[PDB]
Protein backbone atom coordinates (compact mmCIF):
# COMPACT_ATOMS: atom_id res chain seq x y z
CA UNK A 1 0.00 0.00 0.00
CA UNK A 2 2.69 2.48 1.17
CA UNK A 3 2.26 5.35 3.64
CA UNK A 4 4.08 8.35 1.96
CA UNK A 5 2.42 10.86 -0.40
CA UNK A 6 5.20 12.31 -2.70
CA UNK A 7 4.90 15.76 -4.23
CA UNK A 8 6.90 17.24 -7.08
CA UNK A 9 6.35 20.88 -8.15
CA UNK A 10 7.45 21.73 -11.74
CA UNK A 11 7.62 25.34 -13.05
CA UNK A 12 7.06 26.31 -16.76
CA UNK A 13 9.58 24.68 -19.02
CA UNK A 14 10.06 27.97 -20.95
CA UNK A 15 11.17 29.63 -17.65
CA UNK A 16 13.27 26.69 -16.50
CA UNK A 17 17.09 26.24 -16.03
CA UNK A 18 18.23 29.41 -17.90
CA UNK A 19 21.72 28.87 -16.43
CA UNK A 20 21.75 25.91 -18.86
CA UNK A 21 21.20 28.36 -21.82
CA UNK A 22 24.95 28.31 -22.75
CA UNK A 23 25.23 24.55 -23.33
CA UNK A 24 21.74 24.01 -24.93
CA UNK A 25 19.24 25.65 -27.31
CA UNK A 26 15.70 26.47 -26.15
CA UNK A 27 14.02 23.25 -27.24
CA UNK A 28 16.90 21.08 -26.03
CA UNK A 29 16.85 22.91 -22.67
CA UNK A 30 13.12 22.19 -22.19
CA UNK A 31 13.64 18.56 -23.20
CA UNK A 32 16.53 18.03 -20.73
CA UNK A 33 14.49 19.73 -18.02
CA UNK A 34 11.54 17.43 -18.86
CA UNK A 35 13.70 14.34 -19.02
CA UNK A 36 15.29 15.14 -15.62
CA UNK A 37 11.82 15.08 -14.12
CA UNK A 38 11.20 11.70 -15.98
CA UNK A 39 14.37 10.15 -14.58
CA UNK A 40 13.51 11.68 -11.09
CA UNK A 41 9.93 10.33 -11.13
CA UNK A 42 11.10 6.97 -12.47
CA UNK A 43 13.54 6.31 -9.65
CA UNK A 44 11.22 7.83 -7.04
CA UNK A 45 8.53 5.33 -8.27
CA UNK A 46 10.61 2.31 -7.23
CA UNK A 47 10.39 3.44 -3.58
CA UNK A 48 8.33 0.92 -1.59
CA UNK A 49 7.19 3.27 1.20
CA UNK A 50 5.33 5.51 -1.39
CA UNK A 51 1.46 5.54 -1.74
CA UNK A 52 1.30 8.15 -4.48
CA UNK A 53 3.29 10.56 -6.58
CA UNK A 54 1.71 13.89 -7.29
CA UNK A 55 3.13 16.33 -9.72
CA UNK A 56 1.83 19.91 -9.65
CA UNK A 57 2.60 22.08 -12.63
CA UNK A 58 1.14 24.72 -14.99
CA UNK A 59 3.03 23.21 -17.98
CA UNK A 60 0.93 20.90 -20.18
CA UNK A 61 4.04 19.07 -21.54
CA UNK A 62 5.22 18.26 -18.03
CA UNK A 63 1.62 17.37 -17.11
CA UNK A 64 1.43 14.84 -20.03
CA UNK A 65 4.78 13.27 -19.18
CA UNK A 66 4.11 12.84 -15.47
CA UNK A 67 0.63 11.43 -16.28
CA UNK A 68 2.25 9.12 -18.81
CA UNK A 69 4.37 7.56 -16.08
CA UNK A 70 1.30 6.90 -13.87
CA UNK A 71 1.51 9.92 -11.50
CA UNK A 72 -1.31 12.17 -10.38
CA UNK A 73 -1.03 15.63 -11.96
CA UNK A 74 -2.51 18.80 -10.42
CA UNK A 75 -2.97 21.87 -12.56
CA UNK A 76 -0.96 24.59 -10.73
CA UNK A 77 -3.39 27.31 -9.50
CA UNK A 78 -0.61 29.60 -8.24
CA UNK A 79 -1.34 33.19 -9.47
CA UNK A 80 0.74 35.06 -12.09
CA UNK A 81 1.88 37.80 -9.70
CA UNK A 82 2.32 35.49 -6.66
CA UNK A 83 5.38 36.54 -4.64
CA UNK A 84 6.38 32.93 -3.70
CA UNK A 85 5.22 30.61 -6.53
CA UNK A 86 7.24 27.45 -5.69
CA UNK A 87 6.17 27.18 -2.01
CA UNK A 88 2.58 28.08 -2.99
CA UNK A 89 2.33 25.29 -5.61
CA UNK A 90 3.77 22.91 -3.00
CA UNK A 91 1.15 23.97 -0.34
CA UNK A 92 -1.63 23.73 -2.91
CA UNK A 93 -0.49 20.12 -3.61
CA UNK A 94 -0.07 19.33 0.14
CA UNK A 95 -3.69 20.38 0.75
CA UNK A 96 -4.83 17.79 -1.77
CA UNK A 97 -2.36 15.07 -1.04
CA UNK A 98 -3.08 15.30 2.70
CA UNK A 99 -6.70 14.04 2.23
CA UNK A 100 -4.97 10.68 1.45
CA UNK A 101 -1.73 10.56 3.55
CA UNK A 102 -0.44 11.56 6.97
CA UNK A 103 3.24 11.57 5.77
CA UNK A 104 4.22 13.84 2.84
CA UNK A 105 7.57 14.21 0.98
CA UNK A 106 8.39 17.07 -1.46
CA UNK A 107 11.07 16.08 -3.99
CA UNK A 108 12.85 18.40 -6.46
CA UNK A 109 12.30 17.52 -10.20
CA UNK A 110 15.90 17.94 -11.33
CA UNK A 111 17.59 14.97 -9.75
CA UNK A 112 18.46 12.85 -12.84
CA UNK A 113 21.06 10.68 -11.11
CA UNK A 114 18.58 9.84 -8.33
CA UNK A 115 18.65 6.14 -7.29
CA UNK A 116 15.52 4.49 -5.74
CA UNK A 117 17.64 3.32 -2.78
CA UNK A 118 18.78 6.88 -2.10
CA UNK A 119 15.23 8.16 -1.78
CA UNK A 120 14.07 5.02 0.25
CA UNK A 121 16.94 5.42 2.67
CA UNK A 122 16.27 9.18 3.08
CA UNK A 123 12.60 8.45 3.80
CA UNK A 124 13.57 5.63 6.32
CA UNK A 125 15.66 8.26 8.21
CA UNK A 126 12.96 10.96 7.93
CA UNK A 127 10.55 8.64 9.84
CA UNK A 128 12.71 9.17 12.98
CA UNK A 129 11.46 12.83 13.06
CA UNK A 130 8.48 15.10 12.47
CA UNK A 131 10.00 17.50 9.90
CA UNK A 132 13.22 16.74 8.01
CA UNK A 133 15.07 17.71 4.86
CA UNK A 134 18.07 16.83 2.67
CA UNK A 135 20.39 19.67 1.56
CA UNK A 136 21.57 19.90 -2.01
CA UNK A 137 25.10 19.00 -3.07
CA UNK A 138 26.60 22.51 -2.61
CA UNK A 139 24.85 22.83 0.81
CA UNK A 140 22.85 26.04 0.35
CA UNK A 141 19.52 24.70 -1.06
CA UNK A 142 17.26 21.68 -0.47
CA UNK A 143 16.67 18.40 -2.47
CA UNK A 144 13.79 16.93 -0.39
CA UNK A 145 11.50 18.01 2.48
CA UNK A 146 9.71 15.44 4.71
CA UNK A 147 6.68 15.88 7.06
CA UNK A 148 5.43 12.94 9.21
CA UNK A 149 1.88 13.63 10.51
CA UNK A 150 2.38 17.47 10.34
CA UNK A 151 2.41 20.42 7.93
CA UNK A 152 5.42 20.72 5.56
CA UNK A 153 5.74 24.52 5.94
CA UNK A 154 8.06 24.58 2.87
CA UNK A 155 10.75 27.24 2.65
CA UNK A 156 12.04 26.24 -0.83
CA UNK A 157 14.01 28.79 -2.86
CA UNK A 158 17.31 30.60 -2.01
CA UNK A 159 19.12 29.63 1.24
CA UNK A 160 16.37 26.95 1.65
CA UNK A 161 18.97 24.86 3.57
CA UNK A 162 19.34 27.60 6.22
CA UNK A 163 15.63 28.49 6.22
CA UNK A 164 14.59 24.80 6.62
CA UNK A 165 17.13 24.45 9.47
CA UNK A 166 15.57 27.57 11.13
CA UNK A 167 12.02 26.17 10.47
CA UNK A 168 13.10 23.37 12.84
CA UNK A 169 13.29 20.64 10.21
CA UNK A 170 16.08 18.17 10.96
CA UNK A 171 18.95 17.83 8.43
CA UNK A 172 19.25 14.20 7.28
CA UNK A 173 22.91 13.38 6.68
CA UNK A 174 23.14 10.26 4.46
CA UNK A 175 25.57 10.73 1.52
CA UNK A 176 22.92 9.98 -1.25
CA UNK A 177 24.92 11.91 -3.93
CA UNK A 178 22.23 11.27 -6.61
CA UNK A 179 19.53 12.77 -4.34
CA UNK A 180 21.66 15.83 -3.40
CA UNK A 181 23.10 16.56 -6.88
CA UNK A 182 20.30 18.66 -8.48
CA UNK A 183 21.05 20.36 -11.91
CA UNK A 184 20.76 24.16 -12.30
CA UNK A 185 24.08 24.90 -14.05
CA UNK A 186 26.44 23.22 -16.51
CA UNK A 187 28.82 22.10 -13.75
CA UNK A 188 25.84 20.50 -11.92
CA UNK A 189 25.07 18.53 -15.12
CA UNK A 190 28.70 17.32 -15.25
CA UNK A 191 28.70 16.24 -11.62
CA UNK A 192 25.38 14.45 -12.16
CA UNK A 193 26.77 12.70 -15.26
CA UNK A 194 29.68 11.37 -13.25
CA UNK A 195 27.12 9.84 -10.79
CA UNK A 196 25.24 8.42 -13.75
CA UNK A 197 22.05 9.97 -14.95
CA UNK A 198 19.04 8.03 -16.10
CA UNK A 199 17.93 7.18 -19.65
CA UNK A 200 15.67 10.08 -20.43
CA UNK A 201 18.38 12.57 -19.44
CA UNK A 202 21.22 10.69 -21.23
CA UNK A 203 19.15 10.68 -24.45
CA UNK A 204 18.05 14.29 -24.10
CA UNK A 205 21.62 15.64 -23.57
CA UNK A 206 22.51 13.96 -26.94
CA UNK A 207 20.53 16.59 -29.08
MG1 LIG B 1 17.77 22.60 -8.58
MG1 LIG C 1 19.76 23.99 -6.69
Please write out the topology.
Blueprint: E1 4-9, H1 26-45, E2 50-57, H2 60-68, E3 72-75, H3 85-97, E4 103-107, H4 116-126, E5 131-135, E6 142-148, H5 160-167, E7 170-171, H6 177-180, H7 186-195, H8 199-204
Parallel strand pairs: 1-2, 1-4, 2-3, 5-7
Antiparallel strand pairs: 4-6, 5-6
Helix pairs in contact: 1-2
Bound molecules: magnesium ion (MG) (2 copies).
Residues 108, 110, 182, 184 line the site of one magnesium ion.
Supply the key terms.
7 strands; monomer; 8 helices; binds magnesium ion; alpha/beta; 207 residues; 7-stranded mixed β-sheet
Structure description:
This protein has 207 residues and is an alpha/beta fold. It has one domain. It is built from 8 helices and 7 strands, in the order E-H-E-H-E-H-E-H-E-E-H-E-H-H-H. The chain has a 7-stranded mixed β-sheet, sandwiched between helices. The relative contact order is 0.19. Bound molecules: magnesium ion (2 copies). One magnesium ion (MG) is lined by residues 108, 110, 182, 184. It comes from Mycobacterium tuberculosis (strain ATCC 25618 / H37Rv). Pathway: Cofactor biosynthesis; coenzyme F420 biosynthesis. One of its GO terms (molecular function) is GTP binding. Guanylyltransferase that catalyzes the activation of phosphoenolpyruvate (PEP) as enolpyruvoyl-2-diphospho-5'-guanosine, via the condensation of PEP with GTP. It is involved in the biosynthesis of coenzyme F420, a hydride carrier cofactor. Keywords: GTP-binding, Nucleotide-binding, Nucleotidyltransferase, Transferase.
Amino acid sequence: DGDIGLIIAVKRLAAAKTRLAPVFSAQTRENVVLAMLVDTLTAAAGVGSLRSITVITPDEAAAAAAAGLGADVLADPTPEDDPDPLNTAITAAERVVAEGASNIVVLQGDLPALQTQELAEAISAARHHRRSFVADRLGTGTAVLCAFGTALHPRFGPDSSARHRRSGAVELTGAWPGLRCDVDTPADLTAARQLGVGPATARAVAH
